RNA sequence: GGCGACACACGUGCUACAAUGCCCACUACAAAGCGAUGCCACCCGGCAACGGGGAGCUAAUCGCAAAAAGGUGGGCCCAGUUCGGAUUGGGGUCUGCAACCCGACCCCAUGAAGCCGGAAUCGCUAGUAAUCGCGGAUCAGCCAUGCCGCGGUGAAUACG
RNA sequence: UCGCCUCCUAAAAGGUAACGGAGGCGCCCAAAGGUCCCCUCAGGCGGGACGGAAAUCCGCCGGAGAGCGCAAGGGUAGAAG
């Protein structure tokens with residue numbers, strides 16, 4: 166069911182199916198279905214349409230999620246555009262933000278190795 | 284990350300506040316990021332020390348929890364052969 | 366998941382406690 | 391024209407928040423989650439959040455500790 | 461003559477409003493929305509027809525009218541394809557069907573678009589016409605999601621008897637064209 | 642301010658790629674050591690880190706600690722997946738005069754690479770290898786996945 | 802180099818030479834043929850998801866600069882396309 170921006174997860178437990186949304190994770194998941202009052206271990210296969218409506222209405226509202234909060238997150242990094250701080254430059258150069266070790270490692274932001282040789 | 288303290292340098296503020304009544308001149312230095320962005324005197328320039336010299340940083344809202352020296356990189360890097 | 370900060374197992378390995386590992390009872 | 395195109399039946403279609411008509415198309419009635427002409431998201435404007443600004447809150451969060459005040 | 465809510469909404473609301481906004485002196489000087497033509501740039505079907513047919517019936521479902529294949533005018537070795545080769549579908553629809561499509565477009569499809577802050581107000585022709593791009597085609601109520609194979613889109617041209625791109629800016633604004641301010 | 646720089650190369654390691662596995666709940670079974678300029682039972686607030694109280698203990702008396710792997714129950718059903726946790730946004734806490742460069746945790750949301758490793762290369766012959774947690778030194782705090790110890794379950798094979 | 806085609810030399814009819822200046826041909830098409838009926842290009846400026854100097858789409862402007870199986874000339878949309 167097209168809950169937020171997504172619909173994908175069929176026969177696979179609503180507490181888990183919920184996770185498949187940028188903004189839900191695991192904590193907001195069971196938090197949303199206990200506050201909506203729905204059984205977590207259900208089929209996800211389009212069960213009681215009412216439960217699905219209530220779920221959708223609560224989840225999609227309340228807190229920001231999916232493409233909207235991706236925009237906000239990207240905009241929070243755009244904050245350090247202008248004449249920003251040190252943390253912005255780390256987002257500029259493509260290097261790790263939290264001042265860690267970059268002599269080795271840091272491949273998750275630098276990307277795969279390039280090898281200079283000399 | 285402080286919560287009940289949330290401090291700024293007393294000496295930075297002394298110089299900053301007694302030069303805040305009805306206006307001033309942007310000629311104001313420091314020697315400590317340690318402080319915090321300080322609201323009021325936003326339209327100001329604080330020459331922060333980066334270990335070598337005093338870099339004129341400018342305040343235009345937008346900044347807060349970022350004290351000073353984040354606006355004063357201490358290294359240079361610039362490039363690695365390329 | 367000895368390095369995940371959201372498990373009783375990772376909380377053991379890290380040492381610290383929390384929500385995913387309460388200080389007993 | 392004759393003997394190729396799909397036909398267009400009368401009107402009925404279900405919205406996730408209320409009602410919708412017209413339909414025609416091919417199907418008698420279909421389901422639509424994100425409703426349209428109703429109200430949500432740029433249809434009367436429902437400001438979900440506001441995206442906090444630092445000039446406001448962070449000057450009153452860091453400034454909540456008014457120990458640095460004056 | 462069918463009926464169509466948008467069609468009525470044009471006559472008994474949008475129509476007199478234009479005579480007030482612009483002060484046309486004749487019943488024909490008023491902008492009349494006519495001819496909406498859907499086009500799909502189908503390079504994807506550079507060398508495939510079973511990917512083109514699937515795009516045909518898909519289009520036939522949302523407009524209630526079979527599309528016609530367009531063929532390459534010349535030949536561009538820079539990106540394959542020769543003189544022939546079915547590269548692109550296109551269906552023209554005016555009257556009745558144009559309105560039934562335009563309703564489900566504005567009042568179902570367009571809001572079903574991810575985020576979507578509103579149609580571009582600079583996307584106007586200069587002779588009173590409008591065009592708009594679309595990514596996913598699943599945003600149409602007749603598309604069932606679990607029956608697709610590829611996310612192919614379409615270009616949409618809405619032709620109008622207006623002169624300036626202001627009288628059309630107005631005409632569509634009244635019909636329900638969200639313009640992101 | 643720097644030793645924490647980063648287009649890169651090597652060493653020693655940690656965590657993994659899952660179902661003899663992962664999550665949650667319940668429920669057992671250690672040893673060796675450390676502590677009243679500290680360890681802090683038990684209550685109270687808090688989702689939690691932690692904060693408010695506050696008893697006992699110069700300590701085979703009180704406290705750090707419930708050991709964990711195990712067992713029982715239940716849930717996932719093999720899918721980059723309830724595997725994996727990197728990276729990043731936000732919100733907090735504690736030490737400290739102060740944690741931007743450069744601290745450790747907590748919580749919400751993201752969830753990357755990896756589906757088992759080329760040429761090569763290491764360790765171990767009995768409580769041994771493997772695997773599991775526990776203490777201590779330094780130490781305000783901590784970048785400890787290290788070092789020095791402690792016990793838990795416990796192989797395989799040696800013709801020559 | 803030797804035969805055929807196209808343009809120039811060629812002196813406003815035709816024709817006209819040089820071991821003068823430039824290019825082509827030794828095929829191809831059962832549709833690229835017959836007829837009847839329809840339709841009009843190249844470009845330029847806007848508008849348009851992927852899609853860019855060019856793919857298809859809409860809108861104006863655009864008399865022929867397109868096209869006409871291959872050289873070149875003539876011819877040609879009131880068609881030969």
Ligand SMILES: [Mg+2]
Nearest residue numbers: 266268644645
């Ligand atoms: Mg060093």
Ligand SMILES: [Mg+2]
Nearest residue numbers: 721754755756
């Ligand atoms: Mg991969």
Ligand SMILES: [Mg+2]
Nearest residue numbers: 659719720756
């Ligand atoms: Mg696998």
Ligand SMILES: [Mg+2]
Nearest residue numbers: 765766767769
């Ligand atoms: Mg031996």
Ligand SMILES: [Mg+2]
Nearest residue numbers: 811814815816
């Ligand atoms: Mg002559």
Ligand SMILES: [Mg+2]
Nearest residue numbers: 811812813814
């Ligand atoms: Mg003559």
Ligand SMILES: [Mg+2]
Nearest residue numbers: 810818819821
């Ligand atoms: Mg001659």
